[PDB]
Amino acid sequence: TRKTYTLTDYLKNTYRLKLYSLRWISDHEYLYKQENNILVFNAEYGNSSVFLENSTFDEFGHSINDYSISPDGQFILLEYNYVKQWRHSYTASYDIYDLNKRQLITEERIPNNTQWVTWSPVGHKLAYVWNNDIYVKIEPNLPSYRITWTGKEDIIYNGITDWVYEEEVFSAYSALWWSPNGTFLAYAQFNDTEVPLIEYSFYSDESLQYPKTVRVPYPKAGAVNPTVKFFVVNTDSLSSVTNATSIQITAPASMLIGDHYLCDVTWATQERISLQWLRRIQNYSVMDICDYDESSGRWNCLVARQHIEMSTTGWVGRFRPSEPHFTLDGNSFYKIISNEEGYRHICYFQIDKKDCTFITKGTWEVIGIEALTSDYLYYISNEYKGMPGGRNLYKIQLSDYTKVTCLSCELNPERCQYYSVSFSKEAKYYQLRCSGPGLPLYTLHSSVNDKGLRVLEDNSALDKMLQNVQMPSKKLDFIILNETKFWYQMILPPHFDKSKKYPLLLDVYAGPCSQKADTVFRLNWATYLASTENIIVASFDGRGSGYQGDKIMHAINRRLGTFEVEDQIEAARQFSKMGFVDNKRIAIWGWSYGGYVTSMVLGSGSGVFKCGIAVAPVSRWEYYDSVYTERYMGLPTPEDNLDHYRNSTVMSRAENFKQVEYLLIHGTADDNVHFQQSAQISKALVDVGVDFQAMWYTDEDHGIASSTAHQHIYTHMSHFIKQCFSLP
Amino acid sequence: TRKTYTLTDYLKNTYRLKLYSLRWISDHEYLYKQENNILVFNAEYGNSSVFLENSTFDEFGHSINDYSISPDGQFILLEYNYVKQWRHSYTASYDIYDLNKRQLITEERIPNNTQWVTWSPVGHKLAYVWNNDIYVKIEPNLPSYRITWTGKEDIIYNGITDWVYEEEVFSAYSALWWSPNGTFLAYAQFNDTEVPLIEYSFYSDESLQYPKTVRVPYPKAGAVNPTVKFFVVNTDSLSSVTNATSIQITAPASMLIGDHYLCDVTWATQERISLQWLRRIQNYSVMDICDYDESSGRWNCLVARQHIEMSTTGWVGRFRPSEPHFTLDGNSFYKIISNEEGYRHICYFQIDKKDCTFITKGTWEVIGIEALTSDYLYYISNEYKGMPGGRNLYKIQLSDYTKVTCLSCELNPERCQYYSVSFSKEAKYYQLRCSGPGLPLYTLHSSVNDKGLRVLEDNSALDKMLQNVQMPSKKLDFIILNETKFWYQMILPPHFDKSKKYPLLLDVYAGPCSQKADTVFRLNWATYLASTENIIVASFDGRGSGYQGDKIMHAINRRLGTFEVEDQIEAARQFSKMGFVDNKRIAIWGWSYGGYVTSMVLGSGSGVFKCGIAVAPVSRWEYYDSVYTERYMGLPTPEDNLDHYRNSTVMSRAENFKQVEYLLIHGTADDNVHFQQSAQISKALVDVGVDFQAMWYTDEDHGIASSTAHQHIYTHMSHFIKQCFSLP
Ligand SMILES: *[C@@H]1O[C@H](CO)[C@@H](O[C@@H]2O[C@H](CO)[C@@H](O)[C@H](O)[C@H]2NC(C)=O)[C@H](O)[C@H]1NC(C)=O
Ligand SMILES: *[C@@H]1O[C@H](CO)[C@@H](O[C@@H]2O[C@H](CO)[C@@H](O)[C@H](O)[C@H]2NC(C)=O)[C@H](O)[C@H]1NC(C)=O
Ligand SMILES: *[C@@H]1O[C@H](CO)[C@@H](O[C@@H]2O[C@H](CO)[C@@H](O)[C@H](O)[C@H]2NC(C)=O)[C@H](O)[C@H]1NC(C)=O
Ligand SMILES: *[C@@H]1O[C@H](CO)[C@@H](O[C@@H]2O[C@H](CO)[C@@H](O)[C@H](O)[C@H]2NC(C)=O)[C@H](O)[C@H]1NC(C)=O
Ligand SMILES: *[C@@H]1O[C@H](CO)[C@@H](O[C@@H]2O[C@H](CO)[C@@H](O)[C@H](O)[C@H]2NC(C)=O)[C@H](O)[C@H]1NC(C)=O
Ligand SMILES: *[C@@H]1O[C@H](CO)[C@@H](O[C@@H]2O[C@H](CO)[C@@H](O)[C@H](O)[C@H]2NC(C)=O)[C@H](O)[C@H]1NC(C)=O
Ligand SMILES: *[C@@H]1O[C@H](CO)[C@@H](O[C@H]2O[C@H](CO)[C@@H](O)[C@H](O)[C@H]2NC(C)=O)[C@H](O)[C@H]1NC(C)=O
Ligand SMILES: *[C@@H]1O[C@H](CO)[C@@H](O[C@H]2O[C@H](CO)[C@@H](O)[C@H](O)[C@H]2NC(C)=O)[C@H](O)[C@H]1NC(C)=O
Ligand SMILES: *[C@H]1O[C@H](CO)[C@@H](O[C@@H]2O[C@H](CO)[C@@H](O)[C@H](O)[C@H]2NC(C)=O)[C@H](O)[C@H]1NC(C)=O
Ligand SMILES: C[C@@H]1C(=O)NCCCN1C(=O)C[C@H](N)Cc1cc(F)c(F)cc1F
Ligand SMILES: C[C@@H]1C(=O)NCCCN1C(=O)C[C@H](N)Cc1cc(F)c(F)cc1F
Ligand SMILES: *[C@@H]1O[C@H](CO)[C@@H](O)[C@H](O)[C@H]1NC(C)=O
Ligand SMILES: *[C@@H]1O[C@H](CO)[C@@H](O)[C@H](O)[C@H]1NC(C)=O
Ligand SMILES: *[C@@H]1O[C@H](CO)[C@@H](O)[C@H](O)[C@H]1NC(C)=O
Ligand SMILES: *[C@@H]1O[C@H](CO)[C@@H](O)[C@H](O)[C@H]1NC(C)=O
Ligand SMILES: *[C@@H]1O[C@H](CO)[C@@H](O)[C@H](O)[C@H]1NC(C)=O
Structure with missing residues (x-):
């Protein structure tokens, strides 16, 4: 029986696992796809509305692979003709739909075979990569401004990663970063000219008479690595000048002496960006903090603001040096680093002081920093019950480090010991994602009082079947x-x-x-x-x-x-x-x-x-x-x-x-x-x-x-x- | 038990079949390698003498892969540094040893990485191909004459076949043909310029970090085929001051109208060469018979001497049109072709006559013509006992086709039903090689009265082990x-x-x-x-x-x-x-x-x-x-x-x-x-x-x-x- x-x-x-993937579009609303149509939910009350009916694109003539709403809710990016490449990379076609006048933009459209596209973090500017060159459109229906002219297949990559950077460093195809309010567009350029190629046959459908030979710049251990450069362009000046200048930010001397890598890019404020570089011998990394100089239009990184991170027992970071989380004013940041005991904990840094202060400690580790507000920092750790295989969400008081509240530990201790979290735009709300040991459970919570608002998905359907x-x-x-x-x-x-x-x-x-x-x-x-x-x-x-x-x-x-x-x-x-x-x-x-x-x-x-x-x-x-x-x-x-x-x-x-x-x-x-x-x-x-x-x-x-x-x-x-x- | x-x-x-591979050097003697020493045998009496000591090259420094004694017995080509290519092709290094003065030639030696080499049919001239070009040496120690200058790897092949011609047409890497007395050197030229390349990985030894991609011009069905040209050059009139002149023999118009192949080259006399061409649609082939014009220095192939061979039920020949066997004066020839009943038999052709006369017939087939004298034509067929899977040697009286005599059928009917043969220079003697159904048996015979002189190898040792x-x-x-x-x-x-x-x-x-x-x-x-x-x-x-x-x-x-x-x-x-x-x-x-x-x-x-x-x-x-x-x-x-x-x-x-x-x-x-x-x-x-x-x-x-x-x-x-x- x-x-x-x-x-x-x-x-x-046959036994399907349910989840609840939402997309925050603001500090209290999120999008949810309920049977081919996009719904908008009010976090606070759980009430919703149809954002985009499933019949909106029936005669589009294509199957929409995915969509993306601009930050200001005025436009929606439609992705189709999806063609997978490596782990994160792929190419696709895109159309922009004006949500206000409910029309599909047909002029100055994004090219076919676009490698990457991203809205600006604010408003509706667009930046995309095509044929290995970067382009920016201030308005969906206006012509694009070309940013780079050096793009060259398998050789020069502007705004996108090459094979090894995509797979091992950024875990992404994109290599561009908009500043917070979208004025600046920062990007990396990879040169694979001397990188050896891996070659293998691809047979394709039976109709292909001759097998194709796939060739990809791939540096094997000890071989010539791609080199890299970093630039920032002021997109607000594109409509004022014929050819906006991409200001280069050079790596520090300690890196230029030998082979190195760019391993992190994190904007701090509208005019301050941080970059971390890593030596080919991955036990030494340097973080530069660079400010825009309004008088020279250049970027300067003061050595008094440079931070060194090295390891005597191994490499730096779990897979790479960790990313910093800056306070609103950009004058300090939190970063997970290995303490004197060898355990990764959150350290508080003043941008122009080399010694940081650890705000957590113990024989356990911080997995990641999830959000930072003027009053609290939220992080996930395996501290609970001393189980390195468990994960819980915690909240620490920035004004009193001894005040640490575990936000998920006791919610349902028997069913839930492995949590993931998703905060709203200003961290006003957070969705908790329990993935074990029991059936996945998704819940919504209010940050103002840490109270459970409601259960989003409890997998009752599956529990019923599995019995x-x-x-x-x-x-x-x-x-x-x-x-x-x-x-x-x-x-x-x-x-x-x-x-x-x-x-x-x-x-x-x-x-x-x-x-x-x-x-x-x-x-x-x-x-x-x-x-x-x-x-x-x-x-x-x-x-x-x-x-x-x-x-x-x-x-x-x-x-x-x-x-x-x-x-x-x-x-x-x-x-x-x-x-x-x-x-x-x-x-x-x-x-x-x-x-x-x-x-x-x-x-x-x-x-x-x-x-x-x-x-x-x-x-x-x-x-x-x-x-x-x-x-x-x-x-x-x-x-x-x-x-x-x-x-x-x-x-x-x-x-x-x-x-x-x-x-x-x-x-x-x-x-x-x-x-x-x-x-x-x-x-x-x-x-x-x-x-x-x-x-x-x-x-x-x-x-x-x-x-x-x-x-x-x-x-x-x-x-x-x-x-x-x-x-x- | x-x-x-x-x-x-x-x-x-553990159970090895013994063989007896001899090399006829005249109408009455052959060479046999015994105990690593080369001996010469008198066919008539069976007595032998050492021809070359297995120690002569004791300190040669290289492992000799094979040897090739010049027709006149004056020199011996030593092959080493053998590196296999396809089914028949390979490159190697060569040295020439003078048997008379017991000295190794050290001046003007054959290049390393030579693709093919061959003595002239008589005397001791040499012709070899290196870097896809043809060279000729009148004397082992004198500088060679460059015959061709268009040789180009994977593109132009002079005197050697490309992949498809090697595997499917000539079953040889060689694409050169010496006239009977060595005066003329005929050769084909292949052009694979537009032939697509098959590409595949070669991993090599563990030490190779990146796999290599092998690419070879290989026409798959329907693809662009290589083109071919045929040339004849006089080696008796070469000059070290002027570049040798090659005379081209063009294919008939019935061939030039579309894709075609050169499928056979066979010299008839010192001044007459026959060539067979085949259409890409392989049911139509043409034989041209060309004569050297001493006053013109050109080669003319009279249309009256053209012979067409086609098929209405399939392709022409078993795997290609058969080769002609010309009489001493080259005025007539014997060639196996499918008769009106669809059985392959020998037809007798007059060079300037369209109709040929079949000299054998029946519900069985001639496998191959093996020797021709003014009185008899020797061939192998599966006529005996109507067994298509058996092979025997027969001879037919050219003056009375009703006089056919089986020469191997009754030698040992229980042990031997599958024979192949090897005749001496003027067919005075022949070696019979029985390969089944019993253990291989090698015997020597004299043609005058078909006497069975003696047993060369009877595998009695193997027979003893198999019991x-x-x-x-x-x-x-x-x-x-x-x-x-x-x-x-x-x-x-x-x-x-x-x-x-x-x-x-x-x-x-x-x-x-x-x-x-x-x-x-x-x-x-x-x-x-x-x-x-x-x-x-x-x-x-x-x-x-x-x-x-x-x-x-x-x-x-x-x-x-x-x-x-x-x-x-x-x-x-x-x-x-x-x-x-x-x-x-x-x-x-x-x-x-x-x-x-x-x-x-x-x-x-x-x-x-x-x-x-x-x-x-x-x-x-x-x-x-x-x-x-x-x-x-x-x-x-x-x-x-x-x-x-x-x-x-x-x-x-x-x-x-x-x-x-x-x-x-x-x-x-x-x-x-x-x-x-x-x-x-x-x-x-x-x-x-x-x-x-x-x-x-x-x-x-x-x-x-x-x-x-x-x-x-x-x-x-x-x-x-x-x-x-x-x-x-
Ligand atoms: C969720 O329901 C609420 C409550 O009806 C909607 O709230 C709006 O709130 C504003 C200001 O408080 C009122 O002036 C509006 O009248 C309310 N909306 C309507 C349609 O009356 C809210 O719009 C709903 N949200 C979603 C996503 O459906
Ligand atoms: C990418 O790097 C290569 C070097 O690996 C650069 O190519 C060199 O360019 C200089 C000047 O243009 C030439 O003198 C060299 O001959 C080039 N070397 C090689 C190996 O090609 C190339 O300029 C770089 N590309 C970019 C856009 O930075
Ligand atoms: C925009 O500016 C860039 C940088 O000055 C130009 O790129 C240069 O193009 C010239 C040839 O046109 C090359 O010799 C340089 O090596 C390029 N430099 C870089 C950094 O790429 C680009 O051509 C300009 N675009 C326009 C339309 O003028
Ligand atoms: C985004 O931030 C940029 C950089 O701070 C702002 O641009 C500056 O704006 C000030 C006015 O407050 C000007 O005096 C500077 O000349 C600007 N600098 C640059 C480099 O453009 C920009 O205004 C901000 N965008 C928004 C929408 O607030
Ligand atoms: C091989 O045959 C060729 C052609 O039959 C012989 O060359 C001819 O020799 C005679 C002299 O007896 C000359 O008058 C002709 O002009 C030659 N013809 C050509 C095309 O060269 C050659 O002598 C024979 N070689 C051997 C070794 O017997
Ligand atoms: C050689 O074979 C070809 C192909 O079978 C014959 O050519 C024609 O082939 C097409 C199809 O490819 C048929 O429609 C024709 O009926 C075939 N015959 C002719 C005359 O066109 C060709 O006939 C054959 N040649 C011989 C001598 O048998
Ligand atoms: C085989 O035996 C014959 C003798 O029966 C050898 O002698 C003949 O050939 C020699 C040259 O090869 C000559 O010098 C002799 O005069 C000649 N003798 C006769 C009677 O004809 C012959 O050499 C031997 N062959 C081998 C390969 O050893
Ligand atoms: C080998 O074949 C090629 C191609 O069939 C010959 O070149 C011809 O084809 C070229 C395109 O591949 C054309 O651009 C050329 O005009 C044409 N003729 C010449 C002289 O290139 C090539 O000559 C042949 N080579 C030999 C030695 O015969
Ligand atoms: C072909 O290549 C071989 C191998 O290099 C040459 O033989 C010489 O071999 C010795 C060692 O046995 C080396 O020290 C020499 O440097 C090699 N070359 C020379 C010129 O001495 C050989 O000479 C080459 N021959 C031809 C015809 O190309
Ligand atoms: C999980 C880890 C990460 O978190 N960050 C950086 C890159 C993504 N991460 C990786 O481990 C990627 C590695 N190429 C994965 C990996 C490791 C390995 F040994 C293989 F043979 C094949 C493979 F795909
Ligand atoms: C035996 C036959 C012959 O006698 N003469 C001409 C060439 C040698 N011969 C061949 O059949 C060669 C073919 N490529 C052999 C052959 C046939 C086939 F279907 C394959 F998939 C692979 C292969 F190697
Ligand atoms: C949305 O589209 C789906 C098809 O996937 C259909 O079954 C469903 O009824 C539609 N719902 C609404 C509210 O339009
Ligand atoms: C994309 O490709 C399709 C088909 O090739 C074409 O009809 C369409 O106009 C293209 N769009 C763009 C922006 O190039
Ligand atoms: C970094 O690694 C290299 C190689 O092991 C080592 O020699 C060097 O001392 C290391 N640097 C530090 C700070 O540990
Ligand atoms: C022979 O022909 C080649 C090929 O064009 C040429 O380079 C060479 O100089 C010629 N030599 C003589 C002596 O004519
Ligand atoms: C005869 O036998 C063949 C196979 O040997 C078969 O395909 C065919 O249909 C049979 N009948 C005729 C009339 O050929």
């Missing part, structure tokens, strides 16, 4: 190794019986500053494996994992492929010693960094695992990109860390794979972890006479997320796992 | 289909018992004019499957197969992927009805064209096959090269045969694979059948949700022949077949 969570359930998404299925349970706990505690989670089959021996699958990622043991509720492949196949799926956060202090996170500095790999093997030993695991049936699998660790574990000769699956794995660090790799590994040169680069490859352990069953999978169009990486693993295995299973996914990328391939790969992996555990 | 022939025996070659192994047997027979007989062979497990049910694997190629059912003795994968796994391995020759007349061969004209696929299913259906076949365990596998047919069969929905394996298969004809594809399919244009091109793909049958187990294999560096072909197959399977097994071989080409890859692919396929058949 009562069905279980099956593979088909997962692949067909008729034997769902698995999840356990989150820790084990103590060398005096330090390390967390793990287990997806346990229904009616779990600890007096039995269950087969165990270790689900691993384990890249630096990652966390696989948390309180988030997920419906994924492990759900089906535990529920239907009675398999225990475990994950462990060992050395190198984040949110637990630098002692743990920086333990793998300059040594990827060691401690995080070993700790995974040790975790499996610990789990077997728990008594309910069948030592004859322990498997391991991972994707991406997880594919690498899995492969390293399978080739360790530990004898602990019977089989494993690596999906799109890194196989040798010299094949991965510079920014990410070098951050942890330094440079692959004899004078630096070449020996470890050469000693941490999967290929060097090929012989040991004779002891296990291995399934290797990779998408041929992977622009991130090149197919090359798995090509070298398979070749090494063939060379030592090792048999193994393999699967390539034609034209799929690092995500192997196309609908058909997603279903195909998880189906293939399920058969392999079931076979290895002989269920069947 | 007696081991079996195992997979390791196949992979490690201690349980070897499989081979059954060759036929089934009837619509009053027509089609042959098949079965490799039967040792101690075959017709009262038992054996699983069966259909080994298929089935390309046009192929033959898989024959009397040849082979030690291969099938030998192991039958001997050790007790699997019957069968092969069948259906419509489209060769050596049985055009009625059968041309049955698939303009329709590949139809009758040849259906006939394999029909054969399996019949075998499944036999008492000794387990109809629950019938599999099919093939490589290359056999990979295509295997895939087409598995996606047929016939229900006869449980599983199958396709290695480097063609999946849609538009992806394969023009010369081979168009020969059978015409052009992929709506006005020609595009519909069938689109209806004969593997991809369109994806859905029907849900009922079978399929293993798809392909080398990533396949320059012949591009990985693309399998990449589209897998994508189609993923798109309809059908699970399957796959394996790519990094950097392997169409042969997947490197030692490690070879062992790995056959090990992997063995596991697949055994699992499919439930064999321990």
